[PDB]
From a paper:
The plasma protein α1-antitrypsin is principally synthesised by hepatocytes and protects lung tissue from degradation by inhibiting neutrophil elastase.
The structure of Gly117Phe α1-antitrypsin was solved to 3.2 Å resolution, allowing confident interpretation of the secondary structure of the protein. The asymmetric unit contained three molecules with minimal intermolecular contacts and in an arrangement not suggestive of biologically significant multimerisation. Conversely, repacking of helix F–β-sheet A interface residues, in particular Tyr160, is necessary to avoid steric clashes with the adjacent Phe117 side chain and sustain favourable hydrophobic interactions. The side chain of Tyr160 is in a solvent-exposed position in this mutant in contrast to its buried position within the helix F–β-sheet A interface in wild-type α1-antitrypsin but remains well placed for aromatic interactions with two residues of this cluster, Phe119 and Phe143. The increased biochemical stability conferred by the Gly117Phe mutation on the native fold of α1-antitrypsin is therefore related to increased stabilisation of the F helix. However, stabilisation of the upper turns of the F helix and/or its downward displacement as seen in the structure of Gly117Phe α1-antitrypsin will reduce the propensity for its remodelling.
Author numbering: 24 to 348, 357 to 394
Write the structure that this text describes.
């Protein structure tokens, strides 16, 4: 591809932003899902409001232009939602604009054409009636999987953006279920939760990276995906999260050896809701949320500005995989403690998902 280099960093710089604010919760989101959502939204913005968004995603408009970025995002977004694509990954965008605006046509047009997104006008006057239409709009277009999302709306809201994404993959080489069994997972030096622990002795592209001071495991997905797990040495969690860099993962990936290992990957299902305004705000993206907001590409009547931007992602990890099938002690590698992981898109290498698991039970 050609944006992986930047989304990769966006992914990271986005991560150390949500992690900074609560090193006690699980963290899970799709860097691509979001960039896509703002790259999409950028379509209806102009001037600085516009350039500030694409830059905020680590793009340098003077060394590459939009009419190529949008090109790249769409090439990737296809890969995922594609036809044969049985990777089981759903994702979309909701756009709620205050009813009473002659919204430019072309916009809605492009939006629901390339960036898989739908627009719905609502009555922001009634703080509760909008809350209602929305929570319900979402619960309908989400197949009833996301309920009562928006807990509480604002008062002067006039534009709201909801971005979602569910994912549950099957591995190339699956785990027998008769083998998984409950085990201790040390979330803290004091707390300990019991959790189902999938286990399998196999040939892995696992290796103990000294630079990151942590075991790094690679697990291929059935499809155009790949998951990389990082198990950090005692108290090296913080370090790991600090020394991570695209150039490093990139190298790891390149290598092609493989050695015996006894894996203890935990069976888990986690999600993560986040309010982007604040975070992206820290990452440079402000105008679209401020007052000047140049959203002329969306409406030409009154002023307008993104008031709320929410992101919900859901992941499920299990033993599922392709239906099918005393001489050198292999290293035991048990993920029974906080660990960081990242999902890559096989073709483009872009960062599909990113997270930390601090408690397999927490929600």
């Amino acid at each position: 591809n050609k944006i992986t280099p930047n989304l990769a960093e966006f992914a990271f710089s986005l991560y150390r932003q949500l992690a900074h604010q609560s090193n006690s919760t699980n963290i899970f989101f799709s860097p691509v899902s979001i960039a896509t959502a703002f790259a999409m939204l950028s379509l209806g913005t102009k001037a600085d409001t516009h350039d500030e968004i694409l830059e905020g995603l680590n793009f340098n408009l003077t060394e590459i232009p939009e009419a190529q970025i949008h090109e790249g995002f769409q090439e990737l977004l296809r890969t995922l939602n594609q036809p044969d694509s049985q990777l089981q990954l759903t994702t979309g965008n909701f756009l709620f604009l205050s009813e009473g605006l002659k919204l430019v046509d072309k916009f809605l047009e492009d939006v629901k054409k390339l960036y898989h997104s739908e627009a719905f006008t609502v009555n922001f006057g009634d703080t509760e009636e909008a809350k209602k239409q929305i929570n319900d709009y979402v619960e309908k277009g989400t197949q009833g999987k996301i309920v009562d999302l928006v807990k509480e709306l604002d008062r002067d809201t006039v534009f709201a953006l909801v971005n979602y994404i569910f994912f549950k993959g099957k591995w190339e080489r699956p785990f027998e279920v008769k083998d998984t069994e409950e085990e201790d997972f040390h979330v803290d030096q004091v707390t300990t939760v019991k959790v189902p622990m999938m286990k399998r002795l196999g040939m892995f592209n696992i290796q103990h990276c000294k630079k990151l001071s942590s075991w790094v495991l690679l697990m291929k997905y059935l499809g155009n995906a790949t998951a990389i797990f990082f198990l950090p040495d005692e108290g090296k969690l913080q370090h790991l999260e600090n020394e991570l860099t695209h150039d490093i993962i990139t190298k790891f990936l390149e290598n092609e050896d493989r050695r015996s290992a006894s894996l203890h990957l935990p069976k888990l299902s986690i999600t993560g809701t986040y309010d982007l305004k604040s975070v992206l705000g820290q990452l440079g993206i402000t105008k679209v949320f401020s007052n000047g907001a140049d959203l002329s590409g969306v409406t030409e009547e009154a002023p307008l500005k993104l008031s709320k931007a929410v992101h919900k992602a859901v992941l499920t990890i299990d033993e599922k995989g392709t239906e099918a099938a005393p001489m050198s002690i292999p290293p035991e590698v048990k993920f029974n403690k906080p660990f960081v992981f990242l999902m890559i898109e096989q073709n483009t290498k872009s960062p599909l998902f990113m997270g930390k698991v601090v408690n397999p039970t927490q929600k």
